[PDB]
Amino acid sequence: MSNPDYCIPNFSQTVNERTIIDIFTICRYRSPLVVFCLSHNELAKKYAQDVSMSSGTHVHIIDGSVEITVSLYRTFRTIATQLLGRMQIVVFVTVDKSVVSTQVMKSIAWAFRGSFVELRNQSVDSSTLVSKLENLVSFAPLYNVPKCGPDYYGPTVYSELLSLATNARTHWYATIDYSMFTRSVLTGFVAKYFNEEAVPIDKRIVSIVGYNPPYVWTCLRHGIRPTYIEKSLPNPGGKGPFGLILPVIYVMHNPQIKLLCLDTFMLSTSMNILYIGAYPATHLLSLQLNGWTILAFDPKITSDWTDAMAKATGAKVIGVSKEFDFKSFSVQANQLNMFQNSKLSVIDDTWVETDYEKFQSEKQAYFEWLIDRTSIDVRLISMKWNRSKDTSVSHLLALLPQPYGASIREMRAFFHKKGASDIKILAAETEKYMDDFTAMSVSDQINTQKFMHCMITTVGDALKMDLDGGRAVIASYSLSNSSNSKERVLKFLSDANKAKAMVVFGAPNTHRLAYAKKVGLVLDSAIKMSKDLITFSNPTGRRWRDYGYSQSELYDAGYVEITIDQMVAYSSDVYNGVGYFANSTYNDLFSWYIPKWYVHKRMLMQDIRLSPAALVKCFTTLIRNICYVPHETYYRFRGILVDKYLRSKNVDPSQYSIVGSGSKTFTVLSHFEVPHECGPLVFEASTDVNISGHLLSLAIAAHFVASPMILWAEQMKYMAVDRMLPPNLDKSLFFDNKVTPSGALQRWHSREEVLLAAEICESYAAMMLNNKHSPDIIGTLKSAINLVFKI
Amino acid sequence: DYCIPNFSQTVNERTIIDIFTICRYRSPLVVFCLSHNELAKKYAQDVSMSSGTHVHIIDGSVEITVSLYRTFRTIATQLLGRMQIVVFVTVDKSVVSTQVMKSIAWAFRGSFVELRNQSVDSSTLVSKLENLVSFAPLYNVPKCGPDYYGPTVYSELLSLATNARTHWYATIDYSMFTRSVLTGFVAKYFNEEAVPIDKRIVSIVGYNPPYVWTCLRHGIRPTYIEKSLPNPGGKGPFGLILPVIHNPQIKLLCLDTFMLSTSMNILYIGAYPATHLLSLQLNGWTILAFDPKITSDWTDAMAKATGAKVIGVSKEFDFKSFSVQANQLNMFQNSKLSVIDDTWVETDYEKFQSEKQAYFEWLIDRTSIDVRLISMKWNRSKDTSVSHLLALLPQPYGASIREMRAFFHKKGASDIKILAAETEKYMDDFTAMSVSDQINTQKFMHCMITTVGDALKMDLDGGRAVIASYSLSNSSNSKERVLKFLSDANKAKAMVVFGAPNTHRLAYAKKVGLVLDSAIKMSKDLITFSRDYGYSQSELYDAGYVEITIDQMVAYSSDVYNGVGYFANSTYNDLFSWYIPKWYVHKRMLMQDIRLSPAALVKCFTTLIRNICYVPHETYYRFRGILVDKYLRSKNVDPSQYSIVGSGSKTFTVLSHFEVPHECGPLVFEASTDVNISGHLLSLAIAAHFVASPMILWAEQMKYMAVDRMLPPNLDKSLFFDNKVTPSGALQRWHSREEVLLAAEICESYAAMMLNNKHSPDIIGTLKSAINLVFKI
């Protein structure tokens, strides 16, 4: 009949601008999954029952009654459709590690934005296992294990949700936590790239464009070293060649952030470290330090300590249970023999209760000797400083406050070959200084870490840097010029891709921001834009401007969008960063991109880590539930859309018969062709055409969150024929795709079936979203897909 | 704000609207019974992987009461999730019977499929299984009823010819569902009260055509009461001689359900095959049927399907034999009788009618038989005089055929002359009307089963059953008079089922901006639909009436129900509430099996809010302890007399004896006891903002459950799967009166917390005052 208002499926009454807002809102909950591995199936079943009956959590048990790749396929195909349902989902995995390994299950979990718990080692009465199981029921529908990462150090404290003393509330800073998660994942991705490209460990250095403090920690957590690139040097305003002897004067609650601050910076300066007063050095256990050599001096050191430290960090650890001999000015003393003709830095955390000032006289005289050696490239020495008397020092680059010592009096000195050749430190300056430092707030003390970070900063124009050697760079806002910036950034990226460099690029997505503004989600108050020029502002009222970019602009410059989900899942085997709890609308406005050469080299075979599985079904299923679209009816609508499209190209209806089912979109009756800038699309008599359904649903999802569509399109281009699985990868990572008897990934679609889907994409979006879609989002996707399939 | 749980940023009037919208989807469940577990596993995998449907299989690896408890406690939390749920039941009928599984399905607003008799390669079984995958998230079996006759046609969703679309009139279909359920509830009432079959008659207040069909589907006879009788404008003593102008066999159903309303004994002339009768429940009726094509098998199949006593005669009826001893009419001596004459002939039809007319003019006047009504087809080209003609009517489903229906009756015109020209011109006009206007002429037939009278004045002796529909909420009835009428019905132990707009639910829907004044406006309790009086739960409980939801009525009535189901829930229908008399609630409903329970409402709104607002499971109970702390402070209870625990098992512990003043108390708390407040009361207060509420029926049951209570011996114990049972096999006690009234006392602050102060104080107020009456001292 006439009005669609009294017909189903119904888009006209169910999808208005407020439905679109609601889909945006629901996307903040799009990470419901917990993957929990344990070796006791009766225990799994008990907690599965407890959490589903008490909170409605959906529960699955992969117990080995079914072959593992089939059980994964069944379980995660179901889950993929449900990720926007706003209900928790838990998969218990109780098969052996030899059936599905820790690393494979963690990859799958993170590919579905889930938290991951591995406890299969544990006995049935293990207090930790029972604790984590009971936590499922206490916290559901939330969980206190982070998603997509083992650790979290933000303000959220799940135990506060259970305390009457806090009114059973805790902090929740989604954007800040997600931004930190993102910095972590980008670092992890570069770590994975180094590993995949077999870069020598001493060349695992990444350039961060723009000073970004968290990267020091994230890089050392991943065993790579950071260096910042700044266009200009703000004046430290102190004495010494560099102004770091007394210069003028995100959330991360790490337990011993004090010792982490110095040590992660010092581990940047050199792969070889002399550490005096090392015991216990428990904060080092969290880092990845393959390729580092740590010579540790302390009377408390045991054989047990050394072995634990090398096991946990991977560094070469020579632990000697002695006091250091600061009286012997010989390179042959203190075992410094191994550091001959090598770069070395020294972390001195020794101190004495009585005669401290004169203890500092013996060490400083040792460090002044050691700092100008010639058989050892001595790079930097860190020493505690508390001088009540006046003393002159040689080769002193930086006399610095402690950013995490919180109103204490002790200071830190840094010896360097190019520090001041002579300088007398008086005690009234330092007392009046540390008085100023004691006065400043907690936040202000921490931020003096900038002064330590100057020493691992480079001035220069990032757009002019040398990109040879597969150089790794992380770049977003600061990657820009003062002049002609957008054009210069895209040329730089295009050049970087041509050079086979690894410049990782992020930017606000123009058409997603414009869409979120148009439907009324983002206000002019918070973010404005004219064309691709965007003005941001926080409640503080500080404004900054930056350019939005689109997928087709980047592809034209040789760059392919990848999601944060894909980066962390791809990097799962080396990842040692933080996870997250909530998704953030603000973060979802940004897209991240990697150069085309690396996608072609390493990502054309779509295992689950590089797949769109966690986006390709959940928006479609949400809309079908809201709009009353039966499963088979959905495929009928696809057929009707293709019928209308072919008629608009004056294809005569006798050359094809519409089927509109899940297996056949239409059947070709007689030979015809459709003009297309990537074609013509050719259709042969007596064949079935089945268009690419993933293209259609990814085009919807690209309205709301960062899109895997370009990476998918390159994979789809590769999958015109069967492709043998890579021998170096666990076959289980391909569970979600069809595999032939020969062990090959089975072909997906012809180029016709893909480009036909691209051609009807706009009308599909208009149908599913009741003409409240974005033609611009569709158009940039369509243009990029046509470049992928360029003729 | 940057804290969780978070109601301040998550719940605004727009969230409230979205909750109303999600309530249209609150019937996601399918219960599918079959005998083949590998088939069940295959389609479970197919529908969950393709559409995300949540699937459960009850296969007997776990004892049945525990499996049901586990499965449906889980499902109760998910009913507002806007995702399909399928429970496959593969245990034998001996483990859980068809009627029990159907009662459970419908108590959870589900569709129900019973196919456990089928073999693994049954084409019907596979067909219904594949339908799950094709239609998901929808399904083409109706919820809460076997049949459906509305305009929604699921096959059309699959056809390119229709553009893969079909009709969807949620409000009209749910109103028709409602009529059907109200009828089946009265049929359940008649059965529980063992009313004799001859007395199973219900009065419908206000003319409402569909009730004739729903009543005969349940073996009940309808009677309409209307305050004023508009004369139809035609000839004869009642104006029914030429008055001024879905189901595959609605033609035959329309006349026959009406004719079956007039007498328990029927002479059916020309009855074969009468397939449409097989769908009615006709226990208590006797049908004498004449047709040559009648066989013994047709007779047996007819009595088996309907429960009627069928005498099938394989002859032509003899219109030439003018004695009560002929045509076997002897079985009807000293009883009522009506006659349905479906015969016709294509040669000499006029003379055949002439002879039949002579026969019926004699028959209507018999004295050894009380002949109530005779119907005959009428197509005459000659002028002809007629005696005892009560009505001469078009066939409302006659499309454009030229045949009429004559109705003989002892109170018809003693003699009248029917002019063929007049009837011809009447048929000219009728066949040229639109189909809708044609159908609406069935009101002339229903005139003959309508009584004029003020319903508020009617006699209510003998447990009389009345369906007031919405009619008594019309503003021409002062609230004062209706409530005294209802109060008198309850005291007289009558069964008047009463419906009315719920004043406070409607005001809330308007306040939040769901309903516009362009559609509905209200001043206090006077409501104008674009007019009725709204009623509230506290007004009606004072008049002896208890709210019951439509879900509970159909689940309670499930073993006699033979009505229609529905597919969509409807915002408009949910604005209304239904009420039954307290005396029946106390007699038959205080033991809460699953049919009379709030299980399908008490979890799904709370879980939905907790998901939106980031409320952990344990944190929810901490909030409840915090609310109780504040309440006790506000009553100047010294905080050293209690310690807040705020957990699922203890709300607080009592340290020293203390008391709280209360109009139903005082509430007494003994030292060294744990107090656990009634969580169901709090959840139902939320649900009552959005849909009709089981709160008052629940409260009566809760009052009964201060102590353990033995299970009713003549009910399948599996209907009690969802409540705790004691070692000795009793229903375990629920809560003390202190624990219930404490909940009522904090109810307002709980709704303000859960809905970010966008709740309705009036809805909470009417519930709290009714609960206090339930617990009155």
Ligand SMILES: Nc1nc2c(ncn2[C@@H]2O[C@H](COP(=O)(O)OP(=O)(O)OP(=O)(O)O)[C@@H](O)[C@H]2O)c(=O)[nH]1
């Ligand atoms: N991973 C992946 N596999 C595909 C893709 N397209 C086709 N295939 C293979 O072909 C099958 C289905 O193709 P499609 O017609 O796009 O169907 P779909 O993946 O179920 O998506 P819908 O068509 O919307 O139902 C899958 O089982 C794949 O193994 C694709 O885009 N990505």
Ligand SMILES: Nc1nc2c(ncn2[C@@H]2O[C@H](COP(=O)(O)OP(=O)(O)OP(=O)(O)O)[C@@H](O)[C@H]2O)c(=O)[nH]1
């Ligand atoms: N079968 C049944 N049992 C009830 C009902 N109301 C209360 N109970 C019983 O009383 C016990 C405590 O009830 P409540 O505290 O009111 O509610 P609850 O089911 O525990 O749910 P929450 O307290 O909200 O978490 C329950 O575990 C039930 O066994 C009811 O309506 N039906």
Ligand SMILES: Nc1nc2c(ncn2[C@@H]2O[C@H](COP(=O)(O)OP(=O)(O)O)[C@@H](O)[C@H]2O)c(=O)[nH]1
């Ligand atoms: N492990 C665990 N299970 C629970 C907890 N609370 C409830 N459950 C499970 O959830 C089921 C449902 O109980 P529920 O409906 O919440 O009743 P209630 O416990 O009295 O509030 C129970 O049978 C328990 O198995 C809990 O705190 N821990």
Ligand SMILES: Nc1nc2c(ncn2[C@@H]2O[C@H](COP(=O)(O)OP(=O)(O)O)[C@@H](O)[C@H]2O)c(=O)[nH]1
């Ligand atoms: N029985 C049945 N199963 C289906 C149908 N469509 C999909 N499925 C099942 O659902 C599973 C998931 O299907 P889908 O998500 O479309 O992926 P794909 O069919 O493998 O490309 C498949 O293993 C199918 O067997 C259908 O029309 N009937």
